[PDB]
From Swiss-Prot, chain E:
Keywords recorded for this protein, A-Z: Bacterial flagellum biogenesis
Name listed for the protein in its UniProt record: Basal-body rod modification protein FlgD
Role noted for this protein: Required for flagellar hook formation. May act as a scaffolding protein.
NCBIfam families membership: PRK06655.1-1
InterPro entries: FlgD, FlgD/Vpr_Ig-like, FLgD_Tudor
Signal peptide start and end residues: none
A Pfam family per the record: FlgD
Coiled-coil residue windows: none
Amino acid sequence: AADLQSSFLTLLVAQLKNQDPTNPLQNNELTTQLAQISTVSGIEKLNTTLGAISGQIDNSQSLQATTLIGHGVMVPGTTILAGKGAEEGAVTSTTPFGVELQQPADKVTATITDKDGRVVRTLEIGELRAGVHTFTWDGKQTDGTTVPNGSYNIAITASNGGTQLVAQPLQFALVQGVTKGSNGNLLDLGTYGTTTLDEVRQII
Amino acid sequence: LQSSFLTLLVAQLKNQDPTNPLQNNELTTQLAQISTVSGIEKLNTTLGAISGQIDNSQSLQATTLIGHGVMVPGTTILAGKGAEEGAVTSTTPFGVELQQPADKVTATITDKDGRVVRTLEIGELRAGVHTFTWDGKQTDGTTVPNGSYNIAITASNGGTQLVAQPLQFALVQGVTKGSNGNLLDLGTYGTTTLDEVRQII
Amino acid sequence: AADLQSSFLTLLVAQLKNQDPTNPLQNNELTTQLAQISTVSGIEKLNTTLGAISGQIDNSQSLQATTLIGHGVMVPGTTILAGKGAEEGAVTSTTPFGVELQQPADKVTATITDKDGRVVRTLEIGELRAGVHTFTWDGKQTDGTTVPNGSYNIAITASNGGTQLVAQPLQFALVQGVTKGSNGNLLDLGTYGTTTLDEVRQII
Amino acid sequence: DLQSSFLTLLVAQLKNQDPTNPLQNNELTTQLAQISTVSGIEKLNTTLGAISGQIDNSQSLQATTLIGHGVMVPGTTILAGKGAEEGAVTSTTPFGVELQQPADKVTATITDKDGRVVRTLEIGELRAGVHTFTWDGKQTDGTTVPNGSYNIAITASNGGTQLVAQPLQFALVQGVTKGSNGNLLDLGTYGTTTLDEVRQII
Amino acid sequence: SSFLTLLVAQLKNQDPTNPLQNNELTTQLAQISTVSGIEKLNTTLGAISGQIDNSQSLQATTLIGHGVMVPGTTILAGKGAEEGAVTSTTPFGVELQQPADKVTATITDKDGRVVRTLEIGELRAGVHTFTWDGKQTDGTTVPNGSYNIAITASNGGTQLVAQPLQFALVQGVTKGSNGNLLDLGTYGTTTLDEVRQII
């Protein structure tokens, strides 16, 4: 508040000490300046108070992150876990993936690759709309064979009449805790690391 | 804006009349007015970040809704039978929003082939939202086969048709931050706006 | 609000095309530019903050639905539901009732009648202050035997200094849904209908 | 209609100058400098309406926030009882003390309904703030206390001078009541109290 | 009434040869109304900040029943009363501010005798949470009790100041001398900001 008020007070003493003695300034505008400075000082403290509200909302969001502890979220990343449960006959399931598109794309190709780099399958369902579209891969080879359990990565390329689009890959990431680090309060995803709450696009 | 208003202040200083110079009793007034617009710009952007954080908060805290089932706009109703012996046929509840109260409300339930299987009369429904649970039985009184059915709701008051929008129940699987955010991903149905979501059960 | 910056230019462009060379108008830029254009910018950008706060209100009104589902609130009414559990020997329990008092009363009496209307119980709760007080009927009639299962009417008469006070009867209501009316988020009590947050005297 | 109070005030004192030609032709734009003035308030005052709606949303969210837990509230009542199971160990509601000064000599004396002391608890040194302990439910001799209620008195002293002590007791939250002032934590036996007056939420 | 003593005192040196015009006086009053409205909003915003503080305090009650990561070297090991129960140890952690590649956790029993040595490895700057398997050096089941953990982090042959962390179950939320505090029971009373991680 006084950061500008002290600086704006030098403008009063500069106008009072530097007025033409022949044609001085009417005091009618003097109260306008003081009213205008109070307007400026009022806005300045409004921003300061509102930033504290933003920080408090961030802290409340970090606290609310404990509600879905033990579940998983889709955040910017490419790591994919494929596997099956201990019960016999479990189909090899692939952890859900997703694509975030700034603009809708009429041709989106999503190719999944294993740890060895071998292409396991490419998905051609059609267009994918703008926003976050998430899918749960069936965990099957290109010929229908169940994928080996392990790590996978998806490359998603979108085209608009031959012109590409920049997209954000997202992967299911189970959160095992909420850790207050150097920047803010992030979500520990375990293997995927720690991530803040603002990049969380979709949860499961 | 703050920069673009300084240039209009710099222009006057370097283009003021040489032998008839302008008065000096406005520089702090104009700057304070300039500093007013710059202050609001800092306010205006910060409000947007608050809106984004509120959107993210709405996206979160919805794991309870994901676990529960909600009713979404649509004409779909799912009917099924349990695998246990003597299981009672289950049917997804539906609803309708009425801007104005109506005296004659007709619910026509049809199979996926479009053939009318059930016709129901509800009666008087006041302005607001109404919920119903279909018995899973067609017109003849027999249990309908398990599957998806289309419901058309027509609400009229004194022979004048009113807006009646049938609702669909579906299970939630996730909450999506799409192009705008707060989408209710359910699986087969897709994503649903939280505001357009009717009720949570 | 946006017409200020467009009706300002039409008047301005007039004075620029109609200057008198002998008497050129230097008040085009004396105060007209920096003071009025910014004063327009003060109001035209207060449109957005009102719009931004309106959008934030629109987002916030859905947080009521985003929150948990009501497990039963305490609302005005006189209906009390009584019944017996499936297990043998279960003690009959009744839905709680209560009274809202504008001022404390030196006597508080409760009359419980069955569906037939005859008085089945008289209760002396005691002394209560100004506010909402909630209690639960034991399910016992005047003679102390088990009351028949069903619906009962509770009427609470409270007076201070021999003068009857405004005593509002209140009944329990189980919340079952989160409705959205033409006014905002509302709670659904099922049989009782829909209720508003403001009229909810207490939540159980 | 405030525009007409000045728009027609301008064009009732300008629709005469043009006849009589005291023309400046250049102050004429003061109409806009005044419309932006009346509108510049028309949006601040209406912003107060939106911010009040946000406040109302804040109370609505506070009301929706509901938890079934226990709290620590001023009082001297300590309950003791046994479960329906055979051989259950008597458990007592936790008590406590709020001290605005650190205390080194603190004694918790527990008396029964008869008034006699059943158990005396030696707490010891306590720092500034709220401390919450749990009574073991046993008398001085170590015997299990009878089921019922007891009065706790906590005496706190620092350097030989007795300090003012606030006895505390556990209370299960039973609801949130919307009174004439707002949300009150209806605790049942204890009654209703504000969130701030709760020493500790357990 | 700040801009009212100024306003009343302005009407004294009023100079009838050039007085307050109606435009200036109306503007001056309206400009005062601008200041009043902003200040009314400013006081209003503080109430919303308090409401947000209350809301986050209510949200923090979920921490009860969940354990925080707090500075300390104590790990509790215990075995369930049921038959065949495997002894389990409370999770611990490490807080670092410099990149480290060689981290050793020396776990000793209540008597101080080294019972386990663990090589964690490379850790980035921040809070890292780990769980002791409950097995001592020879692999046998450790007895139930308290264990002291010394965490030494080093990078390229020089040791880094490593802050050991430990599990502490949150027992309640206290309104202390400053505000919301986390009473962890055995560990005591702690605040929100120091919480390394919630489990």
